Structure formats: structure tokens, C-alpha cells
Amino acid sequence: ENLYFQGNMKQIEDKIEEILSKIYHIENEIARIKKLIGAIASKIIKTANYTTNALFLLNKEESEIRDHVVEHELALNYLLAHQGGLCNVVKGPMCSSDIDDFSKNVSDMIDKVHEEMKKFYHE
Amino acid sequence: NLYFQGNMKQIEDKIEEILSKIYHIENEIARIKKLIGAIASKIIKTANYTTNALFLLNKEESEIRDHVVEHELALNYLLAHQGGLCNVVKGPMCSSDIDDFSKNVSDMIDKVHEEMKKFYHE
Amino acid sequence: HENLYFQGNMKQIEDKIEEILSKIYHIENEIARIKKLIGAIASKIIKTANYTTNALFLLNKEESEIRDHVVEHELALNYLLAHQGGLCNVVKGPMCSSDIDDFSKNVSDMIDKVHEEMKKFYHE
């Protein structure tokens, strides 16, 4: 007689207890997702930093090497002054055309990566 | 009688606690999606600057290489009587050629670019 | 009177418990799509770092060889222009015949360190 309020309230209480179980699972899941995202952000910063260091050193050495090759070419055109220069002695499809200096443009790409990482410290 | 009404109060209270928990959850999911997208965007932007830097190092390296190889020929000429370069400088591997990896590096840049294309499909 | 002030309530309690089980179901779906998405981001980081380090590795190796050959040439051009004061007197530079930095080991160091970060993705 009353039983049709006891048993039905019973099924309510057991089911509410499941909802708290499901909520519990979910919470632990979310705290772990946040953990993993933090750890991913961290790997990104460190890799960007390692990579950019490597680019900085490649760039600086490239610029030094270029300055040396520029001077070598001069001192070869001088030693070949009798024989029309390199443009005339080694004979390529273009041969004598200048060497691009991309040190500033690469430094600017390093700057942009560094700017992007500063961003990770605010989000 | 009051056992029924009182237990109904308890249940309604638990629903109130549950629905507020679910809300904070939904707020946490919204903050997480914001972060994952912001992260994706930094990866793409970073990777772009990076391969742009790689492109320009590789291009100039290959140009530098072209001139050095010509410079060796021009020097080997100017030193022919004394056995070219690899007799007047003396080294355990003087004559070892200079690798030209410019196409392998371009292939890598293509691969980074192809990986970043796939971000626009999620 | 007496009988509805129980039944009506229980039905709205049930119907709310219905919507809760629903909102939960939808949350669990969003969580699964977030987890997959993090998984693809991590894979895209590992792959992109791998290609970038391979490019660095090749740029570095060839840069080293070039530098070795430029050093040779510097000595050769100092032998040829010697009676005229070497290369530093003839070329005229505020530094001119400066030494060339050799950062190959420092670059390889950075390569190692990236491989090291990427290793840890296999350990989580």
C-alpha cells in the first residue's frame, strides 16, 4: 500500500548514487586531462627553445661563413685578374651571382617563435 | 508520513548538489576546449616560423656550397704545379666532397607543411 | 489531494534524473572527443619535431663540411697572397680573417635534447 512510495523512492536513491559515481569518474578524468595538457604545453616550450637555439647557431655560423666566402671570391677574382675572373674561369649557368644574406630574416623567425612562447606564460 | 516528505527533501537537495557539480564540469570542459585550440594554433604558428627559418638556411647553404665548390676548382688551378689543393694543405681527408642535402631538407619542410595541413581537418 | 502531493513530485524528480543522465551522457561524449584530440596533437608534435630535427641535423652536417673547406681555402689563399701580406692585408677588413665559429657540437646537443623531450611522450 505504502510500498509504492518506498520502493520507488529506493530506486531513486540508488540511481542518484550512480550519478554521483559517474560524476566522480568524470572529475578525476578532467583533472587528468588538465595535467596532460600542461605537460604538452611544457614539451612544446622546451622543443621550441631547443630548436630555436639550434637555428640561432646555424644562422650565426652561416653569416660568418658567408662573409668568408665573399672575401675568398674577391681574392680569387684578383688572382684571376689576368684571366677574366671567376665569371670567366669556372664558367657556370649563373656562377658569379651574389650569395643571399638571410641572417636578419632567420633572426626575425627566431624572434617570432620567442614571442609565441612568451604567450604560454599568460593563457 | 514525515519520513516520506523528509526523504523527498533530501533527494531534492542531492539533485541541487548534482546539478551544480555538472555545471562546474561543463565550465571546465569549455575552458579545456579553449586551451586545446589555443595550443593547436601555437603549434602551427611556431612550426611555420620554424620551417620558414629552415627554408632560408637551406637556400643560402646551397648557394654558399655552390661557390665553395667553384672556389676549390679555382684554387686547385692556382696550385696545379704544387699538386692542387690536397697536396699543399695536407689532410687525412682533404678531397672529401661537400654533401648537398638541400632536397632532403626541402622534403622535411614539405612534411612539416603536410602535417600542419591536417590541423585544418579537426 | 493527499495522493498527488507525492506522485507529482516523484514524477518531476524522475524526469529531472532523466535529463541529468542525458547531460552526463553528452559530457562523456565530449570528454572522449577531447581525449582523442589531445592524442592527435601529441602525434602531430612528435612528427613535426622529428622532421624539424632531421632538417637541423642535415643543415648542421653540411654546414660543418662547408666550414672545413672554407678553412682549407683560407690557408690556401694565405699561401698564394703571402708575399703580398697574406689575406688579411690584401682584402682589408675591420676583422677580415676572423676565426669561424664551429657550432656543430652545440647544434647536435640541441638535437639530442629535442629527441629527449619526444621520448617522454612514450612514457606517459
Q: What is the 3-state secondary structure (H, E, C) of chain C?
A: CCCHHHHHHHHHHHHHHHHHHHHHHHHHHHHHHHHHHHHHHHHHHHHHHHHHHHHHHHHHHHHHHHHHHHHHHHHHHHHHCHHHCHHHHHCCCCCCCCCCCCCHHHHHHHHHHHHHHHHHHHCC
Interface test with A, best of B18, B32, B36, B42 (most A CBs within 10 A): B42
CA–centroid distance for A119 within its chain? 13
Q: Name which of A36, C45, A52 is nearest B118 in CA terms.
A: C45
Residue A102 makes CB contacts below 8 A (sequence gap 6+) with A59, A62, B56, B57, B59, B60
Q: Is C92 on the interface with A (CB under 8 A)?
A: no
B17 touches chain C (CB under 8 A): no
CATH 1.10.287.210 given to domain A1-123: yes
**Class at the top of the CATH hierarchy for domain C1-124:** mainly alpha
> For chain B, what is the largest distance between any 2 Cα atoms, rounded to a whole number of angstroms?
119
Rg (Cα) of chain B, in Å, rounded? 34
| Sequence ranges of the domains in chain C | 1-124
- For this entry, resolution in Å reads 2.0
Deposited experimental method: X-ray
Cβ contacts of A41 within 8 Å, gap of 6 or more: A120, B39
**Beta-carbon separation of B59 and A26 below 8 A:** no
What CATH number labels B1-122? Answer: 1.10.287.210
**Number of Cβ pairs < 8 A linking chain B and chain C:** 117
Distance (Å) from the alpha carbon of B74 to chain A's nearest alpha carbon:
7
Minimal Cβ distance to B111: which of C51, C61, C72: C51
Q: Among A33, A54, A74, select the one facing C111 at the smallest CB separation.
A: A54
Quick check: A30 and B35 CB within 8 A?
no
Whether C24 contacts chain A with CB within 8 A: yes
Give Rg (Cα) of chain C: 35
Per the CB < 8 Å rule, is C59 touching B61? yes
Under an 8 A CB cutoff, do B29 and C24 touch?
Answer: no
